[PDB]
Amino acid sequence: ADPTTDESGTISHTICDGEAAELSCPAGKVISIVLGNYGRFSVAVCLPDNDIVPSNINCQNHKTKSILEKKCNGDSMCYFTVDKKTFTEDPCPNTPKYLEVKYNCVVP
Amino acid sequence: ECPKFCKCAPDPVQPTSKLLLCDYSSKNTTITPIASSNYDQVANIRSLFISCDNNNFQFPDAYFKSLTALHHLRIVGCETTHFSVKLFEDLAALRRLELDQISTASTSFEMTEDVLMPLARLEKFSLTRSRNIELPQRLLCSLPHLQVLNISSNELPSLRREESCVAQQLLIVDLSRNRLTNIEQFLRGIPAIRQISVAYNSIAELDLSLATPFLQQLDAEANRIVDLTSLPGTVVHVNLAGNALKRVPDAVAELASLVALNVSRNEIEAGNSSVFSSPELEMLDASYNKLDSLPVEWLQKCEKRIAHLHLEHNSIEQLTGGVLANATNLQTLDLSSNQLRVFRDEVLPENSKIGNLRLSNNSLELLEPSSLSGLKLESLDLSHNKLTEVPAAIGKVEQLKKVDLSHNRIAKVYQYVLNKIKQLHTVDLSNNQLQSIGPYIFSDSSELHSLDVSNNEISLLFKDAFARCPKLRKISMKMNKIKSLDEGLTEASGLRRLDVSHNEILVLKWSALPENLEILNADNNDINLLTAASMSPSTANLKSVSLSNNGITIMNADQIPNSLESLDVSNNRLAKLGKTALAAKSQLRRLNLKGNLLTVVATESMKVVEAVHPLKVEISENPLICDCQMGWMIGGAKPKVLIQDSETASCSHAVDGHQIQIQSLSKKDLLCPYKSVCEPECICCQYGNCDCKSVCPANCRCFRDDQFNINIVRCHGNSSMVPKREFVVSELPVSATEIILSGVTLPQLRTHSFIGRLRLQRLHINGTGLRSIQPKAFHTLPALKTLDLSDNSLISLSGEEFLKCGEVSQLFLNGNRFSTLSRGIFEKLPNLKYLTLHNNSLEDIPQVLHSTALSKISLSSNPLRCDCSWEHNAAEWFSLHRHLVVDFPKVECWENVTKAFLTNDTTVLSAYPPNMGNDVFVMPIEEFLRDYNSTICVP
Ligand SMILES: *[C@@H]1O[C@H](CO)[C@@H](O[C@@H]2O[C@H](CO)[C@@H](O[C@@H]3O[C@H](CO[C@H]4O[C@H](CO)[C@@H](O)[C@H](O)[C@@H]4O)[C@@H](O)[C@H](O)[C@@H]3O)[C@H](O)[C@H]2NC(C)=O)[C@H](O)[C@H]1NC(C)=O
Ligand SMILES: *[C@@H]1O[C@H](CO)[C@@H](O[C@@H]2O[C@H](CO)[C@@H](O)[C@H](O)[C@H]2NC(C)=O)[C@H](O)[C@H]1NC(C)=O
Ligand SMILES: *[C@@H]1O[C@H](CO)[C@@H](O[C@@H]2O[C@H](CO)[C@@H](O)[C@H](O)[C@H]2NC(C)=O)[C@H](O)[C@H]1NC(C)=O
Ligand SMILES: *[C@@H]1O[C@H](CO)[C@@H](O)[C@H](O)[C@H]1NC(C)=O
Ligand SMILES: *[C@@H]1O[C@H](CO)[C@@H](O)[C@H](O)[C@H]1NC(C)=O
Ligand SMILES: *[C@@H]1O[C@H](CO)[C@@H](O)[C@H](O)[C@H]1NC(C)=O
């Protein structure tokens, strides 16, 4: 889906498995990853087109926030593909996963 | 063994023998013969008691057999009309017979001259409390060895005796409480009599000097005696209370050794002073009389022998001094209820033994300082008088132990009056006009026990007022103007019950209390604050406290002393209760929250740390809320707090606010709303897209239960500011188990609106303007059981919107535009039991509803066509299924009479004249099916 910013200026982003992820900050600022999780925390988000409701909504990859901060922080824009290759592990096999990333844009 | 319905006992008069106590009141069962029970100690039964309350109780002829050693027999309440003569043959050792209540206003009892023939050796015969009895005129002839005769409370109008019968051992006669007017014939010829009690009768003329010459005690209370005729010179006790006395009768004033005279409640005058003769009169009770002043002719002979003088309710104006100045044996003097104004000094002797002096309800104005000089008084009464202070006649006694000075006009209490008496146990200064309680007016009374200054004007308490008294234990100050308790009672460490109720005390300091107080009462004050009961040492000994009708608005752990066993804070303004107020107070047993303004009384304010006992609570009359925090109100916790008034205690509901009975409050009501929360074990709670995160949408109220099982989301578009946006269902909480979007504006259900809601059980998207339902909008709802799409703009429903909803059993389609019921409904609603399709546009009965498992269905207010059954009519399905319709008298046949003529679709209903103003003829459905073959469908 589209990145959404709340009242405190934190931009969130929800990107499905196998898709391209683009984080971007305006001129003069750099990305600051607040949160990061690659897995499944919702039944409704990124529905499989096969009509199989996901039964695993307590799926967590704890290395996600640390791998996103070493990849996107200090940079004004970040690119990668969301799959099990980028986050080093499959936190719940046979469950559709997605990266949910929230980030702040701070002056370097 | 003791026989049937009777219990043995060792005889009190003779503890070596065996008493028996029978109670055949219990039942109408048979009367076991005592001789046939062969009790091991029948000859040890010397006294025998029987008690009944049933009527017509008759003894078996063979009952009192083998009791040949029975000396005393008491029969109580066993009514009859006569006893068996054979019964009293085997009881020659009987020395004392008692009968009590053997007849009422109905049963007539006759003491037979032959029933008592085998009862000569009866040395005491007692027959009390019974009406309409007949005694033989030769009653005394059967019982000559008679000594004490008691037939009281029997209302016998006359007593007649044959003149040949002489009771020559009759000592004490009891005729009291009867209707006797003259008995001379009975007493004539019975001279042994020494004691007579003809009390409570209507005797008019009494003559006894030539009848009972040894009469020693005469009791004639409550009669019509105007003046006596003659007495024996032996009378030592004359009781003439409640008679027609206008002066002292002569034959009593002439007595030789009269010890006591009670001529009270008469209308005697003290002008007609007869001269008393006996110098042995030691007690004189001329109370409730019309005396103007004490006559000296009376006491003239017993000045050094008189001891007790009760003289209340007379009209003594002044004790003309000198009359009592020689009564050295005078131990009691009662002069209450007269018109004395000054109790002068020359009335009493110098060293009188007076221990009782009673002078209440008088006009007493002055007690001169010498009338009570040197007295050894124990009890001094002077209430309802006109004293102006505590008079110094009372400084002279040193033995004074109890004092009453209430309802007077005392304005002040000095130091010397009530200090110089050390032996004073009790003081009363209530209902006076004290303005304050001065210091050291109570110090040197180190034997004080009770002090009363209630119903006064005390505005202040001096710090030193209560020192030097380590025995004063009870003080009452109710109904005063105590506006503060500073200083005044901190020092008296022997007090145990203090009264400061009905005052002006604004704030309550526990430190401003004595240190051994055990009962406190601060009722009907202005108290609105409780100090630190934890930084106050004078709380360790407090057991009960009542702060009812005050203004305490909060109570915490520090304001509730931990050692109290009782607490009463009823009719206060308690909105909060500190959340550990009853935690560390393990000793409390009762708790009164009656009449407060509490709303949420949390579970932690009643959880008692290691309470061994049930905690009693009155929590009625409080604007409570029954939410999930009132878990203790159901009673499944320990300590198991038991609500006393759960039968009237009420609370309002957590959703709508209707009244709930706390007695019938269940685990289902306790809802406590929220705006955002997280389930147990929820890992993504910090995130925005989290399933276990229950975030409330705008314009929605969200409730829940304690354990994340109930989740009510009840949204409403009851806004005159009409929702200019559809309702976005994707914003609702994920774990919702009931959804009501009712009044909001939502015209379309997209594909996959409700996907993945496994917990959802009720869904009421009614009143949203739903025109279209995209398929799979109700996807995977396994616990979904009730669906309500009523009162919208739906015209037909396919069955492709319902995917995986097998548990559905209720579907509400009323208030729409439904004309057809497809088959796709029952292929996906198997558990379907309840259905509503009333108030719609149904033109006929859908032919899917001929083979369905519905149990209740509603199909009224629908334009249904009724023909004579071309095989599918309405009245044909209805006469077969009219039980399935909940509103059968609410369905009506419709036929547009204007269309069916132009379309030639002629039906049986276009031949009646249509309703005035309409093109349709309307007839109730019951009228069509009853009149089916009778008139309508006849060819
Ligand atoms: C001599 O004859 C007297 C007839 O006047 C006998 O007097 C009887 O005394 C008893 C005992 O008191 C009465 O029974 C009750 O008495 C109380 C007394 O007042 C108490 O109560 C009031 C409040 O009600 C209180 O203000 C006082 O301080 C007392 O504590 C009455 O109030 C009761 O209503 C009730 O009458 C008898 O009524 C009274 N008369 C009779 C006919 O019984 C006296 O007993 C005789 N002498 C002996 C030695 O027996
Ligand atoms: C207080 O004293 C007065 C005396 O005047 C009592 O008044 C009389 O009470 C008697 C009762 O024995 C009545 O028979 C009289 O009629 C009353 N006198 C009247 C009405 O003038 C009064 O009852 C006493 N009260 C108390 C509590 O002791
Ligand atoms: C039958 O259903 C219709 C529609 O649900 C009801 O008409 C509504 O009536 C209420 C109050 O009478 C109004 O506030 C609404 O605006 C009406 N809606 C429409 C679409 O007209 C009607 O009252 C129902 N009749 C019965 C007997 O229940
Ligand atoms: C007479 O008997 C009755 C009841 O048994 C008792 O109350 C009363 O005091 C008796 N009187 C006597 C023994 O003088
Ligand atoms: C009391 O007794 C004495 C004895 O001498 C007598 O003189 C006196 O008059 C009596 N009465 C009074 C009121 O003193
Ligand atoms: C919708 O149904 C609910 C019951 O869940 C009812 O209380 C409410 O009144 C209905 N809405 C309207 C607008 O009638």
PDB file of N, CA and C in Angstrom, chain B residues 74 87 150 159 251-252 255 272 472 495 639 660 684 787:
ATOM      1  N   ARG B  74     -47.527 -30.852  88.843  1.00  0.00           N
ATOM      2  CA  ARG B  74     -47.885 -29.605  88.172  1.00  0.00           C
ATOM      3  C   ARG B  74     -48.412 -29.930  86.782  1.00  0.00           C
ATOM      4  N   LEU B  87     -58.112 -41.803  88.611  1.00  0.00           N
ATOM      5  CA  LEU B  87     -56.759 -41.340  88.320  1.00  0.00           C
ATOM      6  C   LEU B  87     -56.013 -40.981  89.604  1.00  0.00           C
ATOM      7  N   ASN B 150     -53.980 -21.358  96.366  1.00  0.00           N
ATOM      8  CA  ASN B 150     -53.758 -20.426  95.251  1.00  0.00           C
ATOM      9  C   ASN B 150     -54.752 -20.715  94.124  1.00  0.00           C
ATOM     10  N   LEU B 159     -67.303 -16.931  95.546  1.00  0.00           N
ATOM     11  CA  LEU B 159     -66.741 -18.119  96.174  1.00  0.00           C
ATOM     12  C   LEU B 159     -67.613 -18.488  97.359  1.00  0.00           C
ATOM     13  N   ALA B 251     -58.992   1.703 110.901  1.00  0.00           N
ATOM     14  CA  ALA B 251     -58.580   0.361 111.320  1.00  0.00           C
ATOM     15  C   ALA B 251     -57.194  -0.028 110.809  1.00  0.00           C
ATOM     16  N   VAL B 252     -56.539   0.821 110.016  1.00  0.00           N
ATOM     17  CA  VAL B 252     -55.145   0.634 109.625  1.00  0.00           C
ATOM     18  C   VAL B 252     -54.230   1.530 110.446  1.00  0.00           C
ATOM     19  N   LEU B 255     -53.278   0.079 113.909  1.00  0.00           N
ATOM     20  CA  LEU B 255     -52.583  -1.202 113.979  1.00  0.00           C
ATOM     21  C   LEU B 255     -51.507  -1.202 115.060  1.00  0.00           C
ATOM     22  N   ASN B 272     -56.747  15.345 106.227  1.00  0.00           N
ATOM     23  CA  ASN B 272     -57.438  14.384 107.067  1.00  0.00           C
ATOM     24  C   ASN B 272     -56.428  13.497 107.785  1.00  0.00           C
ATOM     25  N   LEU B 472     -12.813   6.901  83.996  1.00  0.00           N
ATOM     26  CA  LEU B 472     -13.934   7.327  83.165  1.00  0.00           C
ATOM     27  C   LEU B 472     -13.839   6.623  81.813  1.00  0.00           C
ATOM     28  N   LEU B 495     -11.060   6.141  78.292  1.00  0.00           N
ATOM     29  CA  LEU B 495     -12.354   6.212  77.627  1.00  0.00           C
ATOM     30  C   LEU B 495     -12.494   5.074  76.624  1.00  0.00           C
ATOM     31  N   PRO B 639     -11.066 -12.862  49.745  1.00  0.00           N
ATOM     32  CA  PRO B 639     -12.226 -12.901  50.652  1.00  0.00           C
ATOM     33  C   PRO B 639     -13.565 -12.731  49.948  1.00  0.00           C
ATOM     34  N   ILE B 660     -30.230  -2.861  36.842  1.00  0.00           N
ATOM     35  CA  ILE B 660     -29.872  -4.250  37.108  1.00  0.00           C
ATOM     36  C   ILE B 660     -29.945  -4.489  38.611  1.00  0.00           C
ATOM     37  N   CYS B 684       2.354  -7.529  18.402  1.00  0.00           N
ATOM     38  CA  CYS B 684       2.427  -6.360  17.529  1.00  0.00           C
ATOM     39  C   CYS B 684       1.692  -5.140  18.073  1.00  0.00           C
ATOM     40  N   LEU B 787     -27.359 -12.413  11.544  1.00  0.00           N
ATOM     41  CA  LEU B 787     -27.110 -11.381  10.549  1.00  0.00           C
ATOM     42  C   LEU B 787     -28.378 -10.567  10.383  1.00  0.00           C
TER      43      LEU B 787
END
